[PDB]
Amino acid sequence: DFGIIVILWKQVTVKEDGKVPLEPFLTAAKEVLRVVDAFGSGFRIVKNDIAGNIKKLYRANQTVHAETLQELIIAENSPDGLATVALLWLKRAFQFIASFLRRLVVTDKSLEQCVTEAYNCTLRPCHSAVIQKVFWGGVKLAPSRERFYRKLHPDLNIAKAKIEEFLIELHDPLCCIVQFFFQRELEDQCWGDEVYQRKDSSEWLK
Protein backbone atom coordinates (compact mmCIF):
# COMPACT_ATOMS: atom_id res chain seq x y z
CA ASP A 1 0.00 0.00 0.00
CA PHE A 2 2.75 2.40 -1.02
CA GLY A 3 0.11 4.98 -1.99
CA ILE A 4 -0.46 5.72 1.70
CA ILE A 5 2.69 7.91 1.55
CA VAL A 6 0.78 10.43 -0.64
CA ILE A 7 -2.08 10.80 1.81
CA LEU A 8 0.15 11.22 4.89
CA TRP A 9 2.29 13.93 3.35
CA LYS A 10 -0.92 15.77 2.26
CA GLN A 11 -1.74 15.84 5.96
CA VAL A 12 1.48 17.84 6.39
CA THR A 13 -0.43 20.98 5.56
CA VAL A 14 1.52 24.19 5.20
CA LYS A 15 -1.04 26.96 5.14
CA GLU A 16 -0.40 30.66 4.75
CA ASP A 17 1.56 30.88 7.99
CA GLY A 18 4.33 28.68 6.54
CA LYS A 19 4.41 26.29 9.52
CA VAL A 20 4.72 22.50 9.25
CA PRO A 21 2.51 20.25 11.46
CA LEU A 22 4.82 18.14 13.69
CA GLU A 23 2.81 14.95 13.97
CA PRO A 24 1.51 14.77 10.43
CA PHE A 25 5.05 15.47 9.15
CA LEU A 26 6.61 12.71 11.32
CA THR A 27 4.06 9.99 10.56
CA ALA A 28 4.57 10.75 6.87
CA ALA A 29 8.39 10.90 7.36
CA LYS A 30 8.32 7.34 8.63
CA GLU A 31 6.64 6.14 5.41
CA VAL A 32 9.55 7.52 3.33
CA LEU A 33 11.57 4.53 4.65
CA ARG A 34 9.56 2.61 2.02
CA VAL A 35 12.05 4.18 -0.39
CA VAL A 36 15.24 2.96 1.29
CA ASP A 37 13.57 -0.44 1.64
CA ALA A 38 13.08 -0.66 -2.14
CA PHE A 39 16.70 0.49 -2.72
CA GLY A 40 18.10 -2.23 -0.42
CA SER A 41 21.04 -2.42 2.03
CA GLY A 42 23.34 -0.12 -0.03
CA PHE A 43 21.14 2.75 1.31
CA ARG A 44 21.92 1.89 4.94
CA ILE A 45 23.38 5.34 5.59
CA VAL A 46 20.15 6.98 4.40
CA LYS A 47 17.83 4.49 6.09
CA ASN A 48 19.51 4.54 9.53
CA ASP A 49 20.09 8.30 9.21
CA ILE A 50 16.42 9.14 8.63
CA ALA A 51 15.30 6.71 11.33
CA GLY A 52 17.57 8.09 14.03
CA ASN A 53 16.09 11.37 13.01
CA ILE A 54 12.43 10.61 13.07
CA LYS A 55 13.08 9.06 16.57
CA LYS A 56 15.26 11.95 17.86
CA LEU A 57 12.63 14.49 16.79
CA TYR A 58 9.99 12.63 18.90
CA ARG A 59 12.50 12.36 21.79
CA ALA A 60 13.41 16.12 21.63
CA ASN A 61 9.72 17.20 21.53
CA GLN A 62 8.30 16.79 25.02
CA THR A 63 8.08 19.51 27.58
CA VAL A 64 8.12 21.85 24.56
CA HIS A 65 5.12 20.09 22.99
CA ALA A 66 5.59 22.16 19.84
CA GLU A 67 2.72 21.70 17.43
CA THR A 68 4.72 22.45 14.23
CA LEU A 69 8.35 21.98 13.15
CA GLN A 70 8.95 25.76 13.23
CA GLU A 71 7.92 26.21 16.85
CA LEU A 72 10.06 23.27 17.97
CA ILE A 73 13.19 24.66 16.41
CA ILE A 74 12.53 28.11 17.87
CA ALA A 75 12.32 26.65 21.41
CA GLU A 76 15.82 25.22 21.11
CA ASN A 77 17.20 28.36 19.50
CA SER A 78 20.56 26.72 18.89
CA PRO A 79 22.33 25.21 15.88
CA ASP A 80 23.56 22.35 18.14
CA GLY A 81 20.16 21.60 19.67
CA LEU A 82 19.22 17.91 19.47
CA ALA A 83 16.06 18.45 17.44
CA THR A 84 17.55 21.20 15.20
CA VAL A 85 20.71 19.27 14.08
CA ALA A 86 18.33 16.31 13.55
CA LEU A 87 15.86 18.15 11.37
CA LEU A 88 18.73 19.74 9.30
CA TRP A 89 19.85 16.19 8.37
CA LEU A 90 16.30 14.79 7.89
CA LYS A 91 15.41 17.65 5.46
CA ARG A 92 18.77 17.11 3.58
CA ALA A 93 17.67 13.48 3.20
CA PHE A 94 14.37 14.26 1.68
CA GLN A 95 15.91 16.85 -0.68
CA PHE A 96 18.26 13.93 -1.73
CA ILE A 97 15.38 11.38 -1.93
CA ALA A 98 13.31 14.00 -3.75
CA SER A 99 16.19 15.00 -6.08
CA PHE A 100 16.70 11.14 -6.71
CA LEU A 101 13.12 9.90 -7.30
CA ARG A 102 12.49 12.83 -9.73
CA ARG A 103 15.52 12.03 -11.82
CA LEU A 104 13.95 8.59 -12.01
CA VAL A 105 10.38 9.43 -12.86
CA VAL A 106 10.86 12.17 -15.45
CA THR A 107 14.34 11.85 -17.10
CA ASP A 108 15.49 8.62 -18.83
CA LYS A 109 18.82 8.47 -17.05
CA SER A 110 19.87 5.25 -15.39
CA LEU A 111 19.22 4.69 -11.67
CA GLU A 112 22.91 4.88 -11.13
CA GLN A 113 23.50 8.39 -12.55
CA CYS A 114 20.35 9.09 -10.65
CA VAL A 115 21.71 8.26 -7.21
CA THR A 116 24.94 10.10 -8.21
CA GLU A 117 23.51 13.49 -9.25
CA ALA A 118 21.06 13.31 -6.34
CA TYR A 119 23.82 12.61 -3.85
CA ASN A 120 26.12 15.11 -5.55
CA CYS A 121 23.65 17.99 -5.08
CA THR A 122 22.61 17.17 -1.49
CA LEU A 123 24.42 15.01 1.04
CA ARG A 124 27.82 14.51 -0.65
CA PRO A 125 29.33 17.76 0.64
CA CYS A 126 27.98 16.89 4.10
CA HIS A 127 29.94 13.59 4.25
CA SER A 128 33.58 13.16 5.14
CA ALA A 129 35.64 11.48 2.48
CA VAL A 130 35.47 8.15 4.29
CA ILE A 131 31.69 8.23 4.56
CA GLN A 132 31.35 9.27 0.88
CA LYS A 133 33.19 6.04 0.06
CA VAL A 134 30.65 4.04 2.13
CA PHE A 135 27.83 5.65 0.11
CA TRP A 136 29.47 4.93 -3.23
CA GLY A 137 30.07 1.39 -1.93
CA GLY A 138 26.31 1.21 -1.30
CA VAL A 139 25.41 2.51 -4.77
CA LYS A 140 27.25 -0.51 -6.12
CA LEU A 141 24.30 -2.51 -4.68
CA ALA A 142 21.62 -0.47 -6.47
CA PRO A 143 18.68 -2.01 -8.39
CA SER A 144 17.89 -0.82 -11.94
CA ARG A 145 15.03 1.72 -12.39
CA GLU A 146 12.55 -1.15 -13.05
CA ARG A 147 13.44 -3.34 -10.08
CA PHE A 148 13.32 -0.19 -7.95
CA TYR A 149 9.80 0.54 -9.15
CA ARG A 150 8.56 -3.00 -8.57
CA LYS A 151 9.83 -3.19 -4.99
CA LEU A 152 7.63 -0.14 -4.18
CA HIS A 153 4.40 -1.59 -5.62
CA PRO A 154 3.90 -4.81 -7.70
CA ASP A 155 2.51 -2.85 -10.64
CA LEU A 156 5.17 -0.57 -12.18
CA ASN A 157 2.66 2.00 -13.52
CA ILE A 158 1.17 2.49 -10.04
CA ALA A 159 4.51 2.61 -8.19
CA LYS A 160 5.60 5.31 -10.68
CA ALA A 161 2.23 7.14 -10.49
CA LYS A 162 2.41 7.04 -6.69
CA ILE A 163 6.03 8.36 -6.31
CA GLU A 164 4.87 11.31 -8.50
CA GLU A 165 1.96 12.19 -6.24
CA PHE A 166 4.28 11.72 -3.23
CA LEU A 167 6.85 14.23 -4.55
CA ILE A 168 4.02 16.74 -5.11
CA GLU A 169 2.92 16.45 -1.47
CA LEU A 170 6.40 16.35 0.11
CA HIS A 171 7.22 19.58 -1.65
CA ASP A 172 6.00 22.49 0.44
CA PRO A 173 6.60 21.05 3.85
CA LEU A 174 10.15 20.05 2.90
CA CYS A 175 10.77 23.41 1.05
CA CYS A 176 9.34 25.30 4.02
CA ILE A 177 11.95 23.64 6.21
CA VAL A 178 14.71 24.18 3.61
CA GLN A 179 14.01 27.95 3.43
CA PHE A 180 13.50 28.05 7.22
CA PHE A 181 16.90 26.48 8.22
CA PHE A 182 18.51 29.26 6.05
CA GLN A 183 16.50 31.97 7.89
CA ARG A 184 18.10 30.48 10.99
CA GLU A 185 21.50 30.20 9.18
CA LEU A 186 21.77 26.46 9.83
CA GLU A 187 22.39 25.17 6.27
CA ASP A 188 25.88 25.83 4.85
CA GLN A 189 26.55 22.81 2.62
CA CYS A 190 23.45 21.16 1.25
CA TRP A 191 21.77 23.11 -1.51
CA GLY A 192 19.75 20.25 -3.00
CA ASP A 193 17.92 20.02 -6.28
CA GLU A 194 17.32 23.53 -7.53
CA VAL A 195 14.58 22.44 -9.99
CA TYR A 196 12.48 20.42 -7.58
CA GLN A 197 12.94 23.22 -5.05
CA ARG A 198 11.47 25.92 -7.28
CA LYS A 199 8.25 27.36 -5.78
CA ASP A 200 5.69 25.40 -7.89
CA SER A 201 5.02 21.81 -6.63
CA SER A 202 4.26 20.19 -10.01
CA GLU A 203 6.50 22.29 -12.31
CA TRP A 204 9.42 19.89 -12.07
CA LEU A 205 7.40 17.29 -14.01
CA LYS A 206 7.48 19.15 -17.35
mmCIF file of all heavy atoms in Angstrom, residues 98-139:
data_model
loop_
_atom_site.group_PDB
_atom_site.id
_atom_site.type_symbol
_atom_site.label_atom_id
_atom_site.label_comp_id
_atom_site.label_asym_id
_atom_site.label_seq_id
_atom_site.Cartn_x
_atom_site.Cartn_y
_atom_site.Cartn_z
ATOM 1 N N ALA A 98 14.131 13.297 -2.785
ATOM 2 C CA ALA A 98 13.313 13.996 -3.753
ATOM 3 C C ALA A 98 14.165 14.131 -5.010
ATOM 4 O O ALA A 98 13.780 13.622 -6.064
ATOM 5 C CB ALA A 98 12.943 15.394 -3.230
ATOM 6 N N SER A 99 15.335 14.790 -4.901
ATOM 7 C CA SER A 99 16.194 14.997 -6.075
ATOM 8 C C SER A 99 16.369 13.653 -6.837
ATOM 9 O O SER A 99 16.314 13.651 -8.070
ATOM 10 C CB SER A 99 17.528 15.702 -5.639
ATOM 11 O OG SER A 99 18.356 16.046 -6.783
ATOM 12 N N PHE A 100 16.549 12.517 -6.128
ATOM 13 C CA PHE A 100 16.695 11.144 -6.708
ATOM 14 C C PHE A 100 15.457 10.654 -7.482
ATOM 15 O O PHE A 100 15.474 10.445 -8.710
ATOM 16 C CB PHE A 100 16.967 10.139 -5.563
ATOM 17 C CG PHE A 100 16.913 8.680 -5.985
ATOM 18 C CD1 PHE A 100 17.463 8.269 -7.231
ATOM 19 C CD2 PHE A 100 16.387 7.695 -5.120
ATOM 20 C CE1 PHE A 100 17.491 6.906 -7.592
ATOM 21 C CE2 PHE A 100 16.408 6.341 -5.478
ATOM 22 C CZ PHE A 100 16.961 5.945 -6.719
ATOM 23 N N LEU A 101 14.366 10.426 -6.732
ATOM 24 C CA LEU A 101 13.117 9.898 -7.296
ATOM 25 C C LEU A 101 12.675 10.645 -8.537
ATOM 26 O O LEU A 101 12.147 10.017 -9.458
ATOM 27 C CB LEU A 101 11.993 9.972 -6.267
ATOM 28 C CG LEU A 101 12.064 9.117 -5.020
ATOM 29 C CD1 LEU A 101 10.935 9.593 -4.106
ATOM 30 C CD2 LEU A 101 11.992 7.584 -5.380
ATOM 31 N N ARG A 102 12.835 11.982 -8.560
ATOM 32 C CA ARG A 102 12.489 12.827 -9.734
ATOM 33 C C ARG A 102 13.352 12.388 -10.897
ATOM 34 O O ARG A 102 12.826 12.116 -11.993
ATOM 35 C CB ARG A 102 12.808 14.320 -9.511
ATOM 36 C CG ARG A 102 13.008 15.080 -10.873
ATOM 37 C CD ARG A 102 13.440 16.507 -10.627
ATOM 38 N NE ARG A 102 14.880 16.699 -10.502
ATOM 39 C CZ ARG A 102 15.713 16.814 -11.541
ATOM 40 N NH1 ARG A 102 15.257 16.739 -12.794
ATOM 41 N NH2 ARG A 102 16.989 17.090 -11.333
ATOM 42 N N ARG A 103 14.670 12.337 -10.699
ATOM 43 C CA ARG A 103 15.521 12.032 -11.825
ATOM 44 C C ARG A 103 15.167 10.682 -12.410
ATOM 45 O O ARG A 103 15.524 10.361 -13.567
ATOM 46 C CB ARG A 103 16.984 12.095 -11.392
ATOM 47 C CG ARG A 103 17.401 13.527 -11.021
ATOM 48 C CD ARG A 103 18.722 13.601 -10.240
ATOM 49 N NE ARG A 103 18.970 14.935 -9.696
ATOM 50 C CZ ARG A 103 19.481 15.966 -10.377
ATOM 51 N NH1 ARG A 103 19.826 15.811 -11.659
ATOM 52 N NH2 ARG A 103 19.621 17.176 -9.807
ATOM 53 N N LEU A 104 14.377 9.927 -11.641
ATOM 54 C CA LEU A 104 13.954 8.592 -12.006
ATOM 55 C C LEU A 104 12.609 8.566 -12.727
ATOM 56 O O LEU A 104 12.390 7.788 -13.672
ATOM 57 C CB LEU A 104 13.843 7.742 -10.739
ATOM 58 C CG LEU A 104 13.517 6.262 -10.863
ATOM 59 C CD1 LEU A 104 14.796 5.493 -11.272
ATOM 60 C CD2 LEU A 104 13.021 5.768 -9.504
ATOM 61 N N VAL A 105 11.711 9.437 -12.304
ATOM 62 C CA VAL A 105 10.375 9.427 -12.860
ATOM 63 C C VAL A 105 10.153 10.322 -14.083
ATOM 64 O O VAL A 105 9.205 10.121 -14.847
ATOM 65 C CB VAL A 105 9.378 9.710 -11.713
ATOM 66 C CG1 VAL A 105 9.859 8.979 -10.436
ATOM 67 C CG2 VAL A 105 9.223 11.191 -11.474
ATOM 68 N N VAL A 106 11.030 11.293 -14.300
ATOM 69 C CA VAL A 106 10.855 12.171 -15.450
ATOM 70 C C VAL A 106 11.940 11.972 -16.511
ATOM 71 O O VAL A 106 11.597 11.729 -17.663
ATOM 72 C CB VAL A 106 10.802 13.616 -15.002
ATOM 73 C CG1 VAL A 106 9.660 13.801 -14.037
ATOM 74 C CG2 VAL A 106 12.067 13.991 -14.349
ATOM 75 N N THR A 107 13.230 12.045 -16.146
ATOM 76 C CA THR A 107 14.339 11.849 -17.099
ATOM 77 C C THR A 107 14.472 10.343 -17.429
ATOM 78 O O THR A 107 13.857 9.493 -16.786
ATOM 79 C CB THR A 107 15.664 12.378 -16.489
ATOM 80 O OG1 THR A 107 15.393 13.562 -15.731
ATOM 81 C CG2 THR A 107 16.691 12.731 -17.573
ATOM 82 N N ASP A 108 15.273 10.015 -18.442
ATOM 83 C CA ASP A 108 15.488 8.619 -18.828
ATOM 84 C C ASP A 108 16.891 8.160 -18.419
ATOM 85 O O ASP A 108 17.442 7.186 -18.937
ATOM 86 C CB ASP A 108 15.287 8.459 -20.359
ATOM 87 C CG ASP A 108 13.943 9.031 -20.835
ATOM 88 O OD1 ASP A 108 12.897 8.566 -20.340
ATOM 89 O OD2 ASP A 108 13.936 9.938 -21.702
ATOM 90 N N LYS A 109 17.489 8.869 -17.470
ATOM 91 C CA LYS A 109 18.824 8.474 -17.051
ATOM 92 C C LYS A 109 18.754 7.219 -16.210
ATOM 93 O O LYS A 109 17.742 6.956 -15.580
ATOM 94 C CB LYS A 109 19.494 9.557 -16.212
ATOM 95 C CG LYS A 109 19.596 10.903 -16.890
ATOM 96 C CD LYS A 109 19.779 11.998 -15.848
ATOM 97 C CE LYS A 109 19.894 13.357 -16.498
ATOM 98 N NZ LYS A 109 19.846 14.428 -15.461
ATOM 99 N N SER A 110 19.835 6.463 -16.174
ATOM 100 C CA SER A 110 19.867 5.247 -15.391
ATOM 101 C C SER A 110 19.637 5.532 -13.900
ATOM 102 O O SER A 110 19.671 6.679 -13.442
ATOM 103 C CB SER A 110 21.228 4.544 -15.608
ATOM 104 O OG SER A 110 22.328 5.219 -14.952
ATOM 105 N N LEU A 111 19.425 4.480 -13.123
ATOM 106 C CA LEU A 111 19.224 4.693 -11.674
ATOM 107 C C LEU A 111 20.569 5.103 -11.089
ATOM 108 O O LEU A 111 20.673 5.884 -10.159
ATOM 109 C CB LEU A 111 18.725 3.408 -11.016
ATOM 110 C CG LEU A 111 18.543 3.592 -9.514
ATOM 111 C CD1 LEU A 111 17.350 2.793 -9.050
ATOM 112 C CD2 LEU A 111 19.837 3.194 -8.793
ATOM 113 N N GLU A 112 21.620 4.540 -11.627
ATOM 114 C CA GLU A 112 22.913 4.878 -11.125
ATOM 115 C C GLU A 112 23.264 6.381 -11.191
ATOM 116 O O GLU A 112 23.613 6.977 -10.181
ATOM 117 C CB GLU A 112 23.935 4.029 -11.889
ATOM 118 C CG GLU A 112 25.314 4.007 -11.279
ATOM 119 C CD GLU A 112 26.245 3.105 -12.057
ATOM 120 O OE1 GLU A 112 25.771 2.030 -12.476
ATOM 121 O OE2 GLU A 112 27.431 3.467 -12.250
ATOM 122 N N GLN A 113 23.176 6.985 -12.357
ATOM 123 C CA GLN A 113 23.504 8.388 -12.551
ATOM 124 C C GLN A 113 22.506 9.114 -11.671
ATOM 125 O O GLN A 113 22.758 10.208 -11.184
ATOM 126 C CB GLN A 113 23.298 8.750 -14.037
ATOM 127 C CG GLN A 113 23.583 10.187 -14.434
ATOM 128 C CD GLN A 113 23.455 10.416 -15.952
ATOM 129 O OE1 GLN A 113 23.652 9.490 -16.753
ATOM 130 N NE2 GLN A 113 23.131 11.653 -16.348
ATOM 131 N N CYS A 114 21.374 8.467 -11.450
ATOM 132 C CA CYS A 114 20.352 9.087 -10.649
ATOM 133 C C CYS A 114 20.725 9.265 -9.191
ATOM 134 O O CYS A 114 20.539 10.340 -8.635
ATOM 135 C CB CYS A 114 19.091 8.298 -10.783
ATOM 136 S SG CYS A 114 17.856 9.258 -10.112
ATOM 137 N N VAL A 115 21.262 8.204 -8.602
ATOM 138 C CA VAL A 115 21.712 8.260 -7.213
ATOM 139 C C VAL A 115 22.911 9.221 -7.133
ATOM 140 O O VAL A 115 23.042 9.961 -6.182
ATOM 141 C CB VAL A 115 22.118 6.838 -6.692
ATOM 142 C CG1 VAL A 115 22.961 6.938 -5.383
ATOM 143 C CG2 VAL A 115 20.824 6.020 -6.405
ATOM 144 N N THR A 116 23.767 9.214 -8.158
ATOM 145 C CA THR A 116 24.935 10.101 -8.209
ATOM 146 C C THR A 116 24.597 11.616 -8.208
ATOM 147 O O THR A 116 25.069 12.381 -7.361
ATOM 148 C CB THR A 116 25.806 9.770 -9.511
ATOM 149 O OG1 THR A 116 26.512 8.521 -9.343
ATOM 150 C CG2 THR A 116 26.823 10.912 -9.801
ATOM 151 N N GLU A 117 23.827 12.068 -9.188
ATOM 152 C CA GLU A 117 23.507 13.489 -9.252
ATOM 153 C C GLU A 117 22.734 13.906 -8.000
ATOM 154 O O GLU A 117 22.946 14.993 -7.481
ATOM 155 C CB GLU A 117 22.660 13.835 -10.464
ATOM 156 C CG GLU A 117 23.412 13.675 -11.795
ATOM 157 C CD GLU A 117 22.487 13.979 -12.950
ATOM 158 O OE1 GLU A 117 21.324 13.504 -12.935
ATOM 159 O OE2 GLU A 117 22.923 14.706 -13.853
ATOM 160 N N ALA A 118 21.821 13.043 -7.544
ATOM 161 C CA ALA A 118 21.055 13.306 -6.345
ATOM 162 C C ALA A 118 21.986 13.524 -5.160
ATOM 163 O O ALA A 118 21.903 14.542 -4.456
ATOM 164 C CB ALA A 118 20.119 12.107 -6.073
ATOM 165 N N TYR A 119 22.878 12.559 -4.953
ATOM 166 C CA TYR A 119 23.824 12.614 -3.848
ATOM 167 C C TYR A 119 24.722 13.839 -4.036
ATOM 168 O O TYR A 119 24.974 14.613 -3.113
ATOM 169 C CB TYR A 119 24.675 11.337 -3.854
ATOM 170 C CG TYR A 119 25.591 11.241 -2.654
ATOM 171 C CD1 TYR A 119 25.093 11.012 -1.368
ATOM 172 C CD2 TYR A 119 26.993 11.360 -2.810
ATOM 173 C CE1 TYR A 119 25.965 10.884 -0.247
ATOM 174 C CE2 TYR A 119 27.848 11.250 -1.713
ATOM 175 C CZ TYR A 119 27.334 11.009 -0.437
ATOM 176 O OH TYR A 119 28.171 10.875 0.650
ATOM 177 N N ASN A 120 25.206 14.013 -5.258
ATOM 178 C CA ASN A 120 26.122 15.107 -5.551
ATOM 179 C C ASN A 120 25.537 16.480 -5.215
ATOM 180 O O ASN A 120 26.274 17.378 -4.780
ATOM 181 C CB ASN A 120 26.529 15.059 -7.022
ATOM 182 C CG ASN A 120 27.514 13.947 -7.311
ATOM 183 O OD1 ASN A 120 28.161 13.406 -6.412
ATOM 184 N ND2 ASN A 120 27.638 13.607 -8.602
ATOM 185 N N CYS A 121 24.216 16.653 -5.382
ATOM 186 C CA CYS A 121 23.652 17.986 -5.082
ATOM 187 C C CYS A 121 23.042 18.139 -3.677
ATOM 188 O O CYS A 121 22.520 19.229 -3.339
ATOM 189 C CB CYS A 121 22.613 18.401 -6.113
ATOM 190 S SG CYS A 121 21.037 17.490 -6.028
ATOM 191 N N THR A 122 23.147 17.091 -2.861
ATOM 192 C CA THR A 122 22.606 17.173 -1.493
ATOM 193 C C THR A 122 23.594 16.804 -0.396
ATOM 194 O O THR A 122 24.313 17.655 0.133
ATOM 195 C CB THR A 122 21.339 16.292 -1.364
ATOM 196 O OG1 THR A 122 21.634 14.942 -1.762
ATOM 197 C CG2 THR A 122 20.212 16.834 -2.243
ATOM 198 N N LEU A 123 23.653 15.516 -0.082
ATOM 199 C CA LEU A 123 24.421 15.014 1.043
ATOM 200 C C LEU A 123 25.930 14.888 0.819
ATOM 201 O O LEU A 123 26.663 14.919 1.806
ATOM 202 C CB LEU A 123 23.875 13.613 1.468
ATOM 203 C CG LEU A 123 22.471 13.552 2.099
ATOM 204 C CD1 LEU A 123 22.011 12.086 2.130
ATOM 205 C CD2 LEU A 123 22.500 14.130 3.514
ATOM 206 N N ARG A 124 26.390 14.723 -0.427
ATOM 207 C CA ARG A 124 27.820 14.508 -0.647
ATOM 208 C C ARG A 124 28.691 15.517 0.091
ATOM 209 O O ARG A 124 29.587 15.114 0.829
ATOM 210 C CB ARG A 124 28.137 14.498 -2.144
ATOM 211 C CG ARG A 124 29.635 14.373 -2.435
ATOM 212 C CD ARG A 124 29.890 14.168 -3.938
ATOM 213 N NE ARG A 124 31.320 14.096 -4.222
ATOM 214 C CZ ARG A 124 31.835 13.746 -5.396
ATOM 215 N NH1 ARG A 124 31.056 13.413 -6.411
ATOM 216 N NH2 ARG A 124 33.154 13.728 -5.551
ATOM 217 N N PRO A 125 28.460 16.826 -0.085
ATOM 218 C CA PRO A 125 29.327 17.755 0.642
ATOM 219 C C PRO A 125 29.269 17.623 2.160
ATOM 220 O O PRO A 125 30.198 18.021 2.853
ATOM 221 C CB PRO A 125 28.841 19.127 0.171
ATOM 222 C CG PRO A 125 27.377 18.880 -0.227
ATOM 223 C CD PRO A 125 27.457 17.535 -0.906
ATOM 224 N N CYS A 126 28.173 17.054 2.659
ATOM 225 C CA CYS A 126 27.979 16.886 4.099
ATOM 226 C C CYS A 126 28.705 15.669 4.680
ATOM 227 O O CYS A 126 28.754 15.515 5.895
ATOM 228 C CB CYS A 126 26.466 16.749 4.388
ATOM 229 S SG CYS A 126 25.404 18.048 3.627
ATOM 230 N N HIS A 127 29.239 14.807 3.816
ATOM 231 C CA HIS A 127 29.937 13.590 4.250
ATOM 232 C C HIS A 127 31.432 13.653 4.122
ATOM 233 O O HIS A 127 31.934 14.090 3.085
ATOM 234 C CB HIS A 127 29.452 12.382 3.434
ATOM 235 C CG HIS A 127 28.041 11.971 3.729
ATOM 236 N ND1 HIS A 127 27.344 11.097 2.921
ATOM 237 C CD2 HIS A 127 27.235 12.241 4.782
ATOM 238 C CE1 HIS A 127 26.162 10.846 3.464
ATOM 239 N NE2 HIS A 127 26.071 11.529 4.593
ATOM 240 N N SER A 128 32.140 13.207 5.159
ATOM 241 C CA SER A 128 33.584 13.156 5.138
ATOM 242 C C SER A 128 33.946 12.249 3.988
ATOM 243 O O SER A 128 33.106 11.487 3.477
ATOM 244 C CB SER A 128 34.132 12.534 6.401
ATOM 245 O OG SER A 128 33.601 11.225 6.535
ATOM 246 N N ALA A 129 35.209 12.307 3.580
ATOM 247 C CA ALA A 129 35.644 11.476 2.478
ATOM 248 C C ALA A 129 35.437 9.985 2.762
ATOM 249 O O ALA A 129 35.088 9.210 1.853
ATOM 250 C CB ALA A 129 37.117 11.762 2.139
ATOM 251 N N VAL A 130 35.644 9.565 4.015
ATOM 252 C CA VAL A 130 35.474 8.146 4.290
ATOM 253 C C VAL A 130 34.006 7.729 4.212
ATOM 254 O O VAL A 130 33.697 6.619 3.777
ATOM 255 C CB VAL A 130 36.058 7.713 5.668
ATOM 256 C CG1 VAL A 130 35.349 8.392 6.823
ATOM 257 C CG2 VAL A 130 35.951 6.237 5.807
ATOM 258 N N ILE A 131 33.093 8.591 4.632
ATOM 259 C CA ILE A 131 31.688 8.233 4.558
ATOM 260 C C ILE A 131 31.192 8.293 3.093
ATOM 261 O O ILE A 131 30.359 7.486 2.689
ATOM 262 C CB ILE A 131 30.841 9.132 5.466
ATOM 263 C CG1 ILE A 131 31.296 8.987 6.956
ATOM 264 C CG2 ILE A 131 29.351 8.830 5.222
ATOM 265 C CD1 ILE A 131 31.215 7.559 7.569
ATOM 266 N N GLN A 132 31.717 9.229 2.284
ATOM 267 C CA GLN A 132 31.350 9.271 0.880
ATOM 268 C C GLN A 132 31.693 7.917 0.246
ATOM 269 O O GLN A 132 30.930 7.390 -0.566
ATOM 270 C CB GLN A 132 32.139 10.366 0.131
ATOM 271 C CG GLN A 132 31.863 11.806 0.627
ATOM 272 C CD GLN A 132 32.632 12.847 -0.199
ATOM 273 O OE1 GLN A 132 33.730 12.568 -0.667
ATOM 274 N NE2 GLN A 132 32.055 14.037 -0.379
ATOM 275 N N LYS A 133 32.834 7.331 0.626
ATOM 276 C CA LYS A 133 33.191 6.036 0.064
ATOM 277 C C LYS A 133 32.180 4.932 0.481
ATOM 278 O O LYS A 133 31.882 4.016 -0.303
ATOM 279 C CB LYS A 133 34.606 5.647 0.488
ATOM 280 C CG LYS A 133 35.656 6.563 -0.123
ATOM 281 C CD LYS A 133 37.088 6.058 0.174
ATOM 282 C CE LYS A 133 38.164 6.705 -0.731
ATOM 283 N NZ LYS A 133 38.476 8.147 -0.448
ATOM 284 N N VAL A 134 31.661 5.004 1.711
ATOM 285 C CA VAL A 134 30.647 4.039 2.132
ATOM 286 C C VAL A 134 29.405 4.199 1.226
ATOM 287 O O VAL A 134 28.825 3.219 0.759
ATOM 288 C CB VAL A 134 30.247 4.261 3.627
ATOM 289 C CG1 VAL A 134 29.048 3.397 4.000
ATOM 290 C CG2 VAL A 134 31.407 3.927 4.557
ATOM 291 N N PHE A 135 29.001 5.439 0.960
ATOM 292 C CA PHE A 135 27.826 5.647 0.112
ATOM 293 C C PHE A 135 28.060 5.101 -1.287
ATOM 294 O O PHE A 135 27.217 4.366 -1.818
ATOM 295 C CB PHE A 135 27.488 7.133 0.034
ATOM 296 C CG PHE A 135 26.285 7.425 -0.806
ATOM 297 C CD1 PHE A 135 24.992 7.253 -0.305
ATOM 298 C CD2 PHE A 135 26.426 7.793 -2.132
ATOM 299 C CE1 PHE A 135 23.883 7.441 -1.118
ATOM 300 C CE2 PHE A 135 25.305 7.980 -2.946
ATOM 301 C CZ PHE A 135 24.029 7.800 -2.425
ATOM 302 N N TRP A 136 29.196 5.462 -1.903
ATOM 303 C CA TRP A 136 29.473 4.934 -3.234
ATOM 304 C C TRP A 136 29.519 3.402 -3.156
ATOM 305 O O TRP A 136 29.035 2.732 -4.063
ATOM 306 C CB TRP A 136 30.765 5.509 -3.845
ATOM 307 C CG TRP A 136 30.691 7.007 -4.030
ATOM 308 C CD1 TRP A 136 31.574 7.947 -3.529
ATOM 309 C CD2 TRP A 136 29.714 7.752 -4.799
ATOM 310 N NE1 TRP A 136 31.200 9.200 -3.935
ATOM 311 C CE2 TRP A 136 30.074 9.115 -4.716
ATOM 312 C CE3 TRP A 136 28.585 7.394 -5.558
ATOM 313 C CZ2 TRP A 136 29.349 10.127 -5.360
ATOM 314 C CZ3 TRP A 136 27.856 8.420 -6.213
ATOM 315 C CH2 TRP A 136 28.252 9.760 -6.101
ATOM 316 N N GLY A 137 30.091 2.840 -2.083
ATOM 317 C CA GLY A 137 30.072 1.386 -1.932
ATOM 318 C C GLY A 137 28.623 0.943 -2.022
ATOM 319 O O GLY A 137 28.291 0.057 -2.793
ATOM 320 N N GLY A 138 27.731 1.582 -1.262
ATOM 321 C CA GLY A 138 26.314 1.215 -1.296
ATOM 322 C C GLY A 138 25.596 1.358 -2.634
ATOM 323 O O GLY A 138 24.659 0.588 -2.928
ATOM 324 N N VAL A 139 26.032 2.312 -3.459
ATOM 325 C CA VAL A 139 25.413 2.513 -4.774
ATOM 326 C C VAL A 139 25.795 1.327 -5.675
ATOM 327 O O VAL A 139 25.097 1.005 -6.630
ATOM 328 C CB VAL A 139 25.868 3.842 -5.391
ATOM 329 C CG1 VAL A 139 25.290 3.969 -6.789
ATOM 330 C CG2 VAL A 139 25.373 5.002 -4.525
#
